[PDB]
Design an enzyme around this catalytic site. Sequence first.
Site, PDB file in Angstrom:
ATOM      1  N   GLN A  58     -57.320  43.319  15.104  1.00 37.60           N
ATOM      2  CA  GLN A  58     -56.670  43.949  15.669  1.00 37.60           C
ATOM      3  C   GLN A  58     -56.109  45.831  14.452  1.00 37.60           C
ATOM      4  O   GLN A  58     -56.251  46.113  15.425  1.00 37.60           O
ATOM      5  CB  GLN A  58     -55.180  43.789  15.136  1.00 37.60           C
ATOM      6  CG  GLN A  58     -54.980  42.805  15.317  1.00 37.60           C
ATOM      7  CD  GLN A  58     -53.308  41.584  14.858  1.00 37.60           C
ATOM      8  OE1 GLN A  58     -52.898  41.747  14.371  1.00 37.60           O
ATOM      9  NE2 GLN A  58     -52.842  40.961  16.600  1.00 37.60           N
ATOM     10  N   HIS A 123     -52.656  42.230  11.397  1.00 37.12           N
ATOM     11  CA  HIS A 123     -50.771  42.437  10.947  1.00 37.12           C
ATOM     12  C   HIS A 123     -51.063  43.576   9.855  1.00 37.12           C
ATOM     13  O   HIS A 123     -50.813  43.798   8.829  1.00 37.12           O
ATOM     14  CB  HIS A 123     -50.418  41.258  10.451  1.00 37.12           C
ATOM     15  CG  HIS A 123     -50.423  40.422  11.429  1.00 37.12           C
ATOM     16  ND1 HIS A 123     -49.311  38.784  11.254  1.00 37.12           N
ATOM     17  CD2 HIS A 123     -50.479  40.224  12.966  1.00 37.12           C
ATOM     18  CE1 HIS A 123     -48.886  38.672  12.443  1.00 37.12           C
ATOM     19  NE2 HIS A 123     -49.634  38.872  13.603  1.00 37.12           N
ATOM     20  N   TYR A 237     -47.812  28.780  16.218  1.00 36.91           N
ATOM     21  CA  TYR A 237     -48.883  28.757  17.223  1.00 36.91           C
ATOM     22  C   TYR A 237     -49.241  27.491  17.581  1.00 36.91           C
ATOM     23  O   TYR A 237     -49.386  26.628  18.839  1.00 36.91           O
ATOM     24  CB  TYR A 237     -49.649  29.551  17.713  1.00 36.91           C
ATOM     25  CG  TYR A 237     -49.643  31.336  17.143  1.00 36.91           C
ATOM     26  CD1 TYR A 237     -49.244  31.850  18.068  1.00 36.91           C
ATOM     27  CD2 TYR A 237     -49.716  31.726  15.858  1.00 36.91           C
ATOM     28  CE1 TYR A 237     -49.845  33.866  18.582  1.00 36.91           C
ATOM     29  CE2 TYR A 237     -49.170  33.221  16.223  1.00 36.91           C
ATOM     30  CZ  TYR A 237     -49.341  33.930  17.032  1.00 36.91           C
ATOM     31  OH  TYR A 237     -48.328  35.202  17.155  1.00 36.91           O
TER      32      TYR A 237
END
Length: 346
Positions: A58, A123, A237
Amino acid sequence: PTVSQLQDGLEHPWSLAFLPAEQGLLITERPGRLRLWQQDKGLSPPIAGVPQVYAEGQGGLLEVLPAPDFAASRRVYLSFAEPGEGGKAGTAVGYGRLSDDDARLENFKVIFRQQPKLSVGNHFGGKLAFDRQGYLFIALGENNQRPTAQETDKLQGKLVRLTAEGAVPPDNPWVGQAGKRPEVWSYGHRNPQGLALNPWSGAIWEHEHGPRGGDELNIPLPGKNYGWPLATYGINYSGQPIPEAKGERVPGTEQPLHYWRVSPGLSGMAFYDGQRFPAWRHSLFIGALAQKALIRLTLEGDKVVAEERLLGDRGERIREVRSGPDGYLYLLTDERDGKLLKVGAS
Ligand SMILES: [Ca+2]
Protein backbone atom coordinates in the site's frame (compact mmCIF):
# COMPACT_ATOMS: atom_id res chain seq x y z
CA PRO A 1 -25.55 11.24 -10.78
CA THR A 2 -23.63 12.35 -13.86
CA VAL A 3 -20.13 10.94 -14.43
CA SER A 4 -17.57 12.21 -16.93
CA GLN A 5 -14.30 10.33 -17.35
CA LEU A 6 -11.66 13.06 -17.71
CA GLN A 7 -8.52 10.91 -17.86
CA ASP A 8 -7.45 7.26 -17.92
CA GLY A 9 -4.11 5.44 -17.82
CA LEU A 10 -3.19 6.51 -14.28
CA GLU A 11 -1.36 3.70 -12.49
CA HIS A 12 -2.96 3.38 -9.05
CA PRO A 13 -3.62 7.11 -8.58
CA TRP A 14 -3.82 8.07 -4.93
CA SER A 15 -4.34 11.81 -4.39
CA LEU A 16 -5.48 14.85 -6.30
CA ALA A 17 -5.41 18.55 -5.56
CA PHE A 18 -6.73 21.57 -7.43
CA LEU A 19 -4.46 24.45 -8.38
CA PRO A 20 -5.92 27.99 -8.55
CA ALA A 21 -8.20 29.25 -11.33
CA GLU A 22 -7.99 26.93 -14.39
CA GLN A 23 -4.36 25.93 -13.82
CA GLY A 24 -5.39 22.31 -13.41
CA LEU A 25 -5.07 19.43 -10.95
CA LEU A 26 -2.08 17.61 -9.51
CA ILE A 27 -2.37 13.82 -9.29
CA THR A 28 -0.12 11.27 -7.62
CA GLU A 29 0.39 7.78 -8.99
CA ARG A 30 1.31 5.51 -6.08
CA PRO A 31 4.30 3.90 -7.90
CA GLY A 32 6.02 7.29 -7.52
CA ARG A 33 4.99 9.91 -10.11
CA LEU A 34 3.38 13.34 -9.87
CA ARG A 35 1.35 14.60 -12.84
CA LEU A 36 -0.54 17.77 -13.75
CA TRP A 37 -3.88 17.39 -15.55
CA GLN A 38 -5.60 20.32 -17.24
CA GLN A 39 -8.76 20.32 -19.32
CA ASP A 40 -7.15 21.79 -22.43
CA LYS A 41 -3.65 20.33 -22.04
CA GLY A 42 -4.43 16.78 -20.90
CA LEU A 43 -2.02 14.88 -18.64
CA SER A 44 1.59 16.05 -18.29
CA PRO A 45 4.66 13.81 -18.26
CA PRO A 46 5.97 13.00 -14.77
CA ILE A 47 7.07 16.12 -12.91
CA ALA A 48 10.78 16.21 -12.04
CA GLY A 49 12.20 16.46 -8.52
CA VAL A 50 9.72 14.13 -6.79
CA PRO A 51 11.21 12.01 -3.96
CA GLN A 52 11.89 8.35 -4.50
CA VAL A 53 9.46 6.20 -2.51
CA TYR A 54 8.92 2.78 -0.97
CA ALA A 55 6.60 1.48 -3.69
CA GLU A 56 5.64 -1.84 -2.08
CA GLY A 57 2.17 -3.02 -0.94
CA GLN A 58 0.00 0.00 0.00
CA GLY A 59 3.03 2.32 0.04
CA GLY A 60 4.46 4.74 -2.47
CA LEU A 61 3.75 8.34 -3.37
CA LEU A 62 0.64 9.28 -1.39
CA GLU A 63 -0.88 12.74 -0.77
CA VAL A 64 -0.30 15.90 -2.79
CA LEU A 65 -1.39 19.12 -1.06
CA PRO A 66 -0.63 22.64 -2.31
CA ALA A 67 -0.07 25.11 0.47
CA PRO A 68 -3.07 27.35 1.27
CA ASP A 69 -1.06 30.23 -0.25
CA PHE A 70 0.00 28.30 -3.38
CA ALA A 71 -0.98 31.20 -5.66
CA ALA A 72 1.84 33.17 -4.01
CA SER A 73 4.34 30.50 -2.88
CA ARG A 74 3.73 27.65 -5.35
CA ARG A 75 4.56 25.38 -2.40
CA VAL A 76 3.44 21.75 -2.72
CA TYR A 77 3.45 19.26 0.17
CA LEU A 78 3.75 15.51 -0.45
CA SER A 79 3.39 12.49 1.79
CA PHE A 80 5.01 9.17 0.88
CA ALA A 81 6.27 5.87 2.19
CA GLU A 82 10.01 6.23 2.78
CA PRO A 83 12.46 3.32 3.20
CA GLY A 84 14.65 3.14 6.24
CA GLU A 85 16.92 1.00 8.37
CA GLY A 86 16.38 -2.73 8.61
CA GLY A 87 14.21 -2.86 5.51
CA LYS A 88 11.29 -1.18 7.29
CA ALA A 89 9.50 1.89 5.96
CA GLY A 90 7.44 4.71 7.42
CA THR A 91 5.49 7.72 6.27
CA ALA A 92 7.29 10.99 5.51
CA VAL A 93 6.02 14.46 4.64
CA GLY A 94 7.92 17.19 2.81
CA TYR A 95 7.46 20.12 0.50
CA GLY A 96 9.00 21.75 -2.53
CA ARG A 97 8.06 24.56 -4.91
CA LEU A 98 6.33 23.79 -8.19
CA SER A 99 8.31 25.63 -10.85
CA ASP A 100 6.58 28.43 -12.77
CA ASP A 101 6.45 26.27 -15.91
CA ASP A 102 5.02 23.23 -14.00
CA ALA A 103 7.98 21.04 -15.04
CA ARG A 104 9.78 20.52 -11.74
CA LEU A 105 9.27 20.34 -8.00
CA GLU A 106 12.12 22.54 -6.77
CA ASN A 107 14.14 21.90 -3.60
CA PHE A 108 11.95 19.15 -2.14
CA LYS A 109 12.82 18.47 1.51
CA VAL A 110 11.32 16.26 4.21
CA ILE A 111 9.93 18.11 7.23
CA PHE A 112 8.46 15.20 9.22
CA ARG A 113 9.10 11.46 9.48
CA GLN A 114 7.11 8.79 11.21
CA GLN A 115 9.41 7.10 13.72
CA PRO A 116 10.13 4.34 14.31
CA LYS A 117 9.77 2.89 10.81
CA LEU A 118 7.85 -0.37 11.22
CA SER A 119 6.01 -1.01 7.94
CA VAL A 120 6.72 -3.69 5.35
CA GLY A 121 4.02 -2.37 3.03
CA ASN A 122 0.87 -1.72 5.06
CA HIS A 123 -0.79 1.06 7.09
CA PHE A 124 1.05 4.25 6.21
CA GLY A 125 -2.03 6.44 6.47
CA GLY A 126 -0.80 9.48 4.58
CA LYS A 127 -3.67 11.95 4.26
CA LEU A 128 -2.92 15.63 4.87
CA ALA A 129 -5.12 18.64 5.62
CA PHE A 130 -4.68 22.25 6.65
CA ASP A 131 -6.90 23.82 9.30
CA ARG A 132 -8.22 27.40 9.20
CA GLN A 133 -5.03 28.78 10.81
CA GLY A 134 -2.70 27.02 8.39
CA TYR A 135 -1.58 24.23 10.71
CA LEU A 136 -0.81 20.95 8.96
CA PHE A 137 -2.59 17.77 10.06
CA ILE A 138 -0.99 14.44 9.13
CA ALA A 139 -2.83 11.11 9.51
CA LEU A 140 -0.56 8.13 10.24
CA GLY A 141 -1.34 4.42 10.24
CA GLU A 142 0.22 2.02 12.76
CA ASN A 143 2.32 0.20 10.08
CA ASN A 144 0.40 -3.04 10.86
CA GLN A 145 1.87 -3.26 14.39
CA ARG A 146 -1.44 -2.99 16.23
CA PRO A 147 -0.37 -2.13 19.83
CA THR A 148 1.87 0.74 18.73
CA ALA A 149 -1.20 2.96 18.13
CA GLN A 150 -1.54 3.14 21.94
CA GLU A 151 2.14 3.85 22.60
CA THR A 152 2.74 7.53 23.33
CA ASP A 153 6.42 7.41 22.31
CA LYS A 154 5.68 6.04 18.80
CA LEU A 155 4.27 7.88 15.78
CA GLN A 156 2.21 4.86 14.69
CA GLY A 157 -1.57 5.25 14.67
CA LYS A 158 -1.44 8.97 15.41
CA LEU A 159 -2.88 12.13 13.99
CA VAL A 160 -0.11 14.76 14.07
CA ARG A 161 -0.40 18.57 14.01
CA LEU A 162 2.58 20.71 12.90
CA THR A 163 3.27 24.22 11.71
CA ALA A 164 3.68 24.97 8.01
CA GLU A 165 7.41 24.30 8.46
CA GLY A 166 7.00 21.06 10.42
CA ALA A 167 7.67 22.55 13.85
CA VAL A 168 5.74 21.52 16.97
CA PRO A 169 3.06 24.04 18.01
CA PRO A 170 3.58 24.71 21.73
CA ASP A 171 -0.11 24.11 22.56
CA ASN A 172 -0.10 20.56 21.18
CA PRO A 173 -1.57 18.33 23.91
CA TRP A 174 1.55 16.36 24.85
CA VAL A 175 4.16 19.17 24.76
CA GLY A 176 6.48 18.94 27.75
CA GLN A 177 5.14 15.53 28.89
CA ALA A 178 7.74 12.83 29.47
CA GLY A 179 7.60 9.79 27.21
CA LYS A 180 5.16 11.32 24.71
CA ARG A 181 5.86 12.52 21.17
CA PRO A 182 4.98 16.25 21.09
CA GLU A 183 3.89 16.12 17.42
CA VAL A 184 0.78 14.09 18.34
CA TRP A 185 -2.77 15.45 18.20
CA SER A 186 -4.68 12.20 18.83
CA TYR A 187 -3.83 8.52 19.13
CA GLY A 188 -5.37 5.07 18.87
CA HIS A 189 -5.96 5.19 15.11
CA ARG A 190 -5.62 2.19 12.78
CA ASN A 191 -5.15 3.20 9.11
CA PRO A 192 -6.63 6.63 8.30
CA GLN A 193 -7.30 7.29 4.62
CA GLY A 194 -9.63 10.26 5.10
CA LEU A 195 -8.88 13.68 6.60
CA ALA A 196 -10.73 16.91 5.95
CA LEU A 197 -11.68 20.26 7.45
CA ASN A 198 -15.39 20.71 8.08
CA PRO A 199 -16.07 24.03 6.27
CA TRP A 200 -18.89 24.99 8.64
CA SER A 201 -17.45 24.14 12.08
CA GLY A 202 -13.72 24.44 11.41
CA ALA A 203 -13.06 21.02 12.94
CA ILE A 204 -10.83 18.37 11.38
CA TRP A 205 -12.71 15.13 10.70
CA GLU A 206 -11.02 11.80 9.99
CA HIS A 207 -11.90 8.32 8.80
CA GLU A 208 -10.06 5.02 8.95
CA HIS A 209 -10.21 1.37 7.96
CA GLY A 210 -11.19 -1.24 10.44
CA PRO A 211 -9.81 -4.74 10.10
CA ARG A 212 -12.45 -7.31 9.12
CA GLY A 213 -15.27 -4.84 9.60
CA GLY A 214 -15.44 -1.70 11.67
CA ASP A 215 -14.47 1.22 9.42
CA GLU A 216 -14.93 4.48 11.34
CA LEU A 217 -15.54 8.20 11.01
CA ASN A 218 -14.13 10.28 13.91
CA ILE A 219 -13.87 13.91 15.01
CA PRO A 220 -10.44 13.75 16.69
CA LEU A 221 -9.98 15.85 19.81
CA PRO A 222 -6.52 16.81 21.16
CA GLY A 223 -4.98 14.26 23.53
CA LYS A 224 -7.86 11.77 23.01
CA ASN A 225 -7.56 8.02 22.43
CA TYR A 226 -9.60 6.58 19.45
CA GLY A 227 -9.07 3.12 20.98
CA TRP A 228 -7.34 0.99 18.35
CA PRO A 229 -6.61 -1.92 19.05
CA LEU A 230 -8.23 -2.07 22.52
CA ALA A 231 -11.59 -0.96 21.09
CA THR A 232 -12.87 -1.91 17.64
CA TYR A 233 -16.05 -2.69 15.72
CA GLY A 234 -14.15 -5.23 13.59
CA ILE A 235 -12.59 -8.67 14.03
CA ASN A 236 -9.39 -10.16 12.67
CA TYR A 237 -9.28 -11.36 9.06
CA SER A 238 -9.24 -15.00 10.23
CA GLY A 239 -12.61 -14.47 11.90
CA GLN A 240 -11.11 -14.56 15.39
CA PRO A 241 -11.24 -11.41 17.56
CA ILE A 242 -8.46 -8.88 17.33
CA PRO A 243 -6.14 -10.21 20.09
CA GLU A 244 -5.80 -6.90 21.98
CA ALA A 245 -9.47 -5.93 21.79
CA LYS A 246 -11.42 -5.57 25.03
CA GLY A 247 -14.71 -4.49 23.46
CA GLU A 248 -16.53 -2.29 21.02
CA ARG A 249 -16.73 0.32 23.81
CA VAL A 250 -13.76 0.76 26.15
CA PRO A 251 -13.68 3.46 28.86
CA GLY A 252 -11.03 6.09 28.30
CA THR A 253 -11.40 5.70 24.52
CA GLU A 254 -13.57 7.83 22.26
CA GLN A 255 -16.32 6.35 20.14
CA PRO A 256 -16.49 7.00 16.40
CA LEU A 257 -19.04 9.49 15.16
CA HIS A 258 -20.21 6.81 12.73
CA TYR A 259 -19.08 3.27 12.01
CA TRP A 260 -19.62 0.46 9.51
CA ARG A 261 -19.78 -3.08 10.88
CA VAL A 262 -19.27 -4.29 7.30
CA SER A 263 -16.30 -2.36 5.89
CA PRO A 264 -16.79 -0.44 2.63
CA GLY A 265 -13.05 0.31 2.61
CA LEU A 266 -13.25 4.05 3.29
CA SER A 267 -10.85 6.15 1.24
CA GLY A 268 -10.97 9.85 0.47
CA MET A 269 -13.32 12.40 1.99
CA ALA A 270 -14.75 15.77 1.00
CA PHE A 271 -17.44 18.06 2.42
CA TYR A 272 -19.70 19.59 -0.24
CA ASP A 273 -20.01 23.37 0.23
CA GLY A 274 -20.63 24.33 -3.40
CA GLN A 275 -23.56 26.09 -5.02
CA ARG A 276 -23.95 24.04 -8.22
CA PHE A 277 -25.81 21.14 -6.55
CA PRO A 278 -27.72 22.60 -3.58
CA ALA A 279 -29.10 19.18 -2.62
CA TRP A 280 -25.53 18.07 -1.86
CA ARG A 281 -24.76 20.95 0.51
CA HIS A 282 -24.02 19.79 4.07
CA SER A 283 -23.09 16.30 2.84
CA LEU A 284 -19.82 14.43 3.37
CA PHE A 285 -18.62 12.22 0.52
CA ILE A 286 -16.37 9.21 1.14
CA GLY A 287 -14.92 6.70 -1.31
CA ALA A 288 -15.37 2.95 -0.92
CA LEU A 289 -12.54 0.75 -2.20
CA ALA A 290 -13.83 -2.73 -1.38
CA GLN A 291 -17.49 -1.90 -2.10
CA LYS A 292 -16.57 0.08 -5.26
CA ALA A 293 -18.86 3.02 -4.59
CA LEU A 294 -19.22 6.58 -3.34
CA ILE A 295 -20.82 7.15 0.07
CA ARG A 296 -22.80 10.31 0.80
CA LEU A 297 -23.52 11.14 4.45
CA THR A 298 -26.10 13.84 5.15
CA LEU A 299 -25.03 15.98 8.12
CA GLU A 300 -26.97 18.02 10.65
CA GLY A 301 -24.15 19.77 12.46
CA ASP A 302 -21.98 17.00 13.87
CA LYS A 303 -24.69 14.34 13.41
CA VAL A 304 -24.88 11.85 10.56
CA VAL A 305 -28.58 11.58 9.67
CA ALA A 306 -28.57 9.51 6.46
CA GLU A 307 -26.25 7.34 4.35
CA GLU A 308 -26.64 7.11 0.56
CA ARG A 309 -24.69 5.00 -1.94
CA LEU A 310 -23.74 6.21 -5.44
CA LEU A 311 -21.82 4.67 -8.39
CA GLY A 312 -22.49 1.08 -7.20
CA ASP A 313 -23.00 -0.20 -10.80
CA ARG A 314 -19.68 1.15 -12.09
CA GLY A 315 -17.29 -1.39 -10.58
CA GLU A 316 -14.55 1.13 -9.69
CA ARG A 317 -12.63 1.28 -6.41
CA ILE A 318 -12.97 4.90 -5.23
CA ARG A 319 -9.64 6.04 -3.76
CA GLU A 320 -9.91 9.85 -3.63
CA VAL A 321 -12.71 12.42 -3.34
CA ARG A 322 -12.33 16.20 -3.62
CA SER A 323 -14.90 18.98 -3.85
CA GLY A 324 -13.94 21.09 -6.86
CA PRO A 325 -14.16 24.88 -7.04
CA ASP A 326 -16.55 24.45 -10.00
CA GLY A 327 -19.12 22.66 -7.82
CA TYR A 328 -18.42 19.10 -9.03
CA LEU A 329 -16.85 16.21 -7.16
CA TYR A 330 -13.58 14.80 -8.48
CA LEU A 331 -12.64 11.16 -7.89
CA LEU A 332 -9.71 8.84 -8.57
CA THR A 333 -10.15 5.10 -9.10
CA ASP A 334 -7.65 2.62 -7.65
CA GLU A 335 -6.72 0.35 -10.55
CA ARG A 336 -3.91 -0.15 -13.05
CA ASP A 337 -5.95 1.77 -15.65
CA GLY A 338 -6.97 4.33 -13.07
CA LYS A 339 -9.41 7.10 -13.89
CA LEU A 340 -10.08 10.72 -13.00
CA LEU A 341 -13.86 11.20 -12.78
CA LYS A 342 -16.00 14.34 -12.58
CA VAL A 343 -19.26 13.69 -10.74
CA GLY A 344 -22.40 15.81 -10.43
CA ALA A 345 -25.86 15.40 -8.93
CA SER A 346 -27.81 15.61 -12.31
CA1 LIG B 1 -11.75 3.72 17.05
